Design a protein around this nucleic acid. Structure first.
Lengths: 245, 117, 52, 229
RNA sequence: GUGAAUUACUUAAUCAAUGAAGCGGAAUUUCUAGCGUUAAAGUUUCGCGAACUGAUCCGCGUUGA
RNA sequence: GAGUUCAGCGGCUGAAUCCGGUGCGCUCUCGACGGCCCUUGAAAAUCCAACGGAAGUG
RNA sequence: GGACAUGGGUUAGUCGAUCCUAAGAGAUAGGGAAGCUCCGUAUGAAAGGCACGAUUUUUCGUGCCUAUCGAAAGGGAAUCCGGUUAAUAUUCCGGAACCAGAAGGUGGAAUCAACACGGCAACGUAAAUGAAGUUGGAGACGUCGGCGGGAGCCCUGG
């Protein structure tokens, strides 16, 4: 009878808390220097970005056209240290931290912050400890096949770039949170998504799951992909439920 | 030959207003002059004591008079040089000015010459 | 001192008489000098290597 | 040779000394009206133009155009001031008691204005028609070559409606029409008519079936040339 | 909407980046947490004077899918 | 010379306001450190300094 | 009597507001919408400056690269003591200071080796020119736990 908590997630009090953010983590804009050669930057500082599991690197590059210094916020890779030189471009060496086009890197290399399409400045393999693996090349069509952290294989333009190495901060989810307070603090610096009340504990007006003299769903929890926004709760378009016993 | 990727709009000649007539037939007389600044002196017991002690006259002053216009109005109306001006808006919504006169002049004779003692 | 209170001082009271004095520490300046000279000698020796 | 005049060459490679100021004209973010002008020109170059419109892209040659305009400038119409003096002179002539016919001679001037020229062509009174190639909207003159051809009026498509305007003391003129010229210039008009006819009227049948446009840009043309090679 | 014998093309529209910075043609910078700008040499004319090249030309469709 | 205390006079005149100890003490602050976090804990106005070297009897 | 009646009373360059920006509100550009208005906040905007030159065919050439509102608890220029009134005070009075800005003047220093010397150094000095452009710093930051110093109060010996 009322719109459900899922439907109210359109904005308002569910926005991301971005007061303490240390910059948007992006690659350099694909310019002439980075397309035909390489450009060197210095890692000024590695910092913690609240709401993010991976540390950020403040790499300072020289502007190739004007007398000033450009500072780029990168997703730090393991091994990055202050004062390390980072080379970005086609002729960059295959060293951890460098940025190269995926077409210039051999099969089986470990890369992160990969561009989906050359020029979007990083899309794939950015969470802490995640990476993308170069599976193969197709020179004739100028494409590169990569393996994503989810295991899905994707075809990307051979000019897409990616930072060599794995993202720093790996193993973050390996340690249990141990208490609701740690979950409380972890999610302050993120959106308003915690704590999560179950729909069975609500009323028929509050949720499709709510109601009854017992806490039961009352209907199959796998809903069609075509269901209305208010109906789309539970397991949406589930192809297979249950454990793999 | 352009060495900058941006196109900034060129500067054009901006003629100044040269009207064919005046929008007002006659300019208004100064609407806040010396006589409208000073309404009348205050002659309460506290005002009298300030006269005899601090060498300070107390005037009922127009709301939109600042410390500068009070000083010139006093100098023009009374030919006395004030050394300080302190103003307050009384709880009834009228400005009151404490005009501290210079050491060369006394507020007593100024008060008698005005005639409000 | 507070930011604006720095404006009342004399010039020599806010800086140090050295290259980059008042902006960098002495050890930082010394690293600047030696690293500058050493890399300059390298680019000379690399140029002499590649010119032949 | 002062030894202190030492050379300090700058390397402008990638990662080397700052890039020098170069011509960046092709990368400028031009204003919207500028882009609209230039991209409109490109659509006319790319799209398949119908023959009735594409016939206006083939205009009179330079030598014939100069010859035509030499003839026209002898027959520019009277200006406002010249009309005023002639009008006044007729007034004193009438006040003096003289015939208005014999005081002023018969005018010999270029006929201008779209409707007036169209009427002259339909009445077969125009011996030469000059149509501006850049009339916008184009429909104002699209029908004119066909109308000229049916009535057998020699017609040429001339550039710069602005040039036609200067002939007739205006800014722009859609068409110009020459009906009568003096016997001194009868040979000159006949020579112009013959050249214009051989250039435009004879080729009218073939031009009616020749679609314009179809020109692709330089980058695609070079790319296809490489593919062919 | 244009072609070719099933396929190509891009100007319509869609998308994405930027500070719309080096696109398409031809002619022919990696042992270091440093600094890098306000051209100087060269070549002609009349003192940080001018002009040409240093910094090749051409096209112009900001580039990429 | 002020403030305070005290002793006198009919506003005025006399004095005194001095010398030291202490602390797991309280209040505020300051300095040097320590621990905690899948939590790392505002911005801008304003002010300063530096690299660079335009420029220059007065 | 905080009632009733008549009068009197609140004084600032230094305390706040004003200035700054926060979350956020919000015009303009543009696009929606029958509309009321909605979305938008450097966006698909021609979104504004600065310096050179015997004056340039006495019709100007040549270079160089973001509104606003929003905090009397955030940021932030600079004031203290004694006294005075029936009622005001870091505001008045007496004394004693301070900050910001402006202009020339006295005195001193540097200067024809134009832009000071000393110390091995960390740095010091009463001075000690510095455009454009770049860059750094202050503003500018959580929380708890003891330990050390200071001030005021407390305690205490004459």
């Amino acid at each position: 009878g009322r719109v459900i908590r899922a439907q109210r997630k359109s904005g308002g009090i569910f926005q991301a808390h971005t007061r303490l953010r240390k910059g948007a983590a992006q690659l350099r804009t694909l310019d002439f220097a980075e397309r035909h050669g390489y450009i060197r930057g210095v890692v000024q500082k590695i910092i913690h970005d609240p709401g993010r599991g991976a540390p950020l690197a403040k790499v300072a590059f020289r502007n190739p056209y004007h007398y000033r210094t450009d500072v780029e916020t990168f997703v730090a890779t393991e091994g990055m240290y202050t004062g390390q030189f980072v080379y970005c471009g086609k002729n960059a060496a295959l060293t951890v931290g460098n940025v190269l086009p995926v077409g210039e890197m051999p099969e089986g290399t470990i890369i992160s912050n990969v561009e989906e399409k050359a020029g979007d400045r990083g899309a794939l393999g950015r969470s802490s400890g995640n990476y993308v693996i170069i599976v193969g090349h197709d020179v004739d069509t100028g494409k590169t096949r990569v393996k994503l952290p989810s295991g899905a294989k994707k075809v990307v333009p051979s000019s897409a770039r990616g930072v060599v190495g794995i993202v720093a901060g790996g193993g973050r989810i390996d340690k249990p949170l141990l208490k609701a307070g740690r979950a409380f603090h972890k999610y302050r610096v993120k959106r308003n998504c915690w704590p999560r009340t179950r729909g069975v504990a609500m009323n028929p007006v509050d949720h499709p799951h709510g109601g009854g003299n017992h806490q039961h769903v009352g209907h199959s929890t796998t809903v069609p992909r075509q269901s209305a926004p208010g109906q789309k709760v539970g397991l949406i378009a589930a192809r297979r439920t249950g454990l793999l016993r | 030959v352009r060495t900058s990727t941006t196109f900034r709009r060129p500067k054009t000649l901006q003629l100044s207003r040269k009207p064919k007539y005046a929008r007002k037939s006659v300019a208004h007389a100064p609407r806040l002059d010396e006589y409208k600044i000073i309404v009348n002196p205050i002659n309460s017991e506290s005002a009298m004591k300030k006269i005899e002690d601090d060498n300070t006259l107390v005037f009922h002053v127009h709301l939109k008079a600042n410390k500068f216009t009070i000083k010139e109005a006093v100098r023009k109306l009374y030919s006395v040089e004030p050394v300080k001006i302190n103003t307050l808006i009384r709880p009834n919504g009228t400005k009151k000015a404490f005009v501290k006169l210079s050491a060369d002049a006394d507020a007593l004779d100024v008060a008698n010459r005005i005639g409000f003692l | 001192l507070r930011p604006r209170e720095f404006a009342r001082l004399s010039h020599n009271k806010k800086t140090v008489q050295r290259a980059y004095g008042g902006c960098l520490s002495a050890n930082a300046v010394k690293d600047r000098i030696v690293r500058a000279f050493l890399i300059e000698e390298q680019k000379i020796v690399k140029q002499k290597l590649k010119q032949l | 040779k002062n030894p202190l005049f030492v050379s300090r060459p700058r390397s402008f490679g990638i990662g080397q000394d700052i890039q020098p100021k170069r011509d960046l004209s092709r990368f400028v973010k031009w204003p919207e009206y500028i882009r609209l002008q230039r991209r409109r020109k490109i659509l006319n170059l790319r799209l398949k133009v119908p023959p009735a419109i594409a016939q206006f892209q083939k205009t009179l040659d330079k030598n014939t155009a100069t010859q035509v305009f030499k003839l026209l400038n002898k027959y520019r119409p009277e200006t406002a001031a010249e009309k005023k003096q002639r009008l006044v002179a007729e007034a004193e002539a009438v006040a003096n008691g003289k015939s208005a016919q014999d005081v002023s001679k018969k005018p010999y001037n270029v006929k201008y204005g779209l409707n007036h020229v169209v009427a002259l062509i339909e009445a077969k009174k125009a011996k030469l028609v000059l149509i501006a190639s850049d009339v916008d909207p184009i429909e104002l003159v699209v029908f004119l070559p066909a109308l000229c051809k049916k009535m057998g009026v020699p017609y040429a498509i001339v550039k710069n409606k602005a040039r036609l305007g200067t002939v007739i003391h205006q800014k722009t003129a859609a068409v110009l029409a020459v009906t009568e010229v003096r016997e001194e210039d009868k040979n000159e008009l006949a020579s112009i008519v013959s050249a214009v006819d051989a250039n435009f009227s004879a080729k009218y049948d073939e031009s009616r079936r020749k679609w314009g446009g179809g020109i692709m840009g330089g980058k695609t043309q070079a790319l296809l040339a490489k593919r062919a090679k």
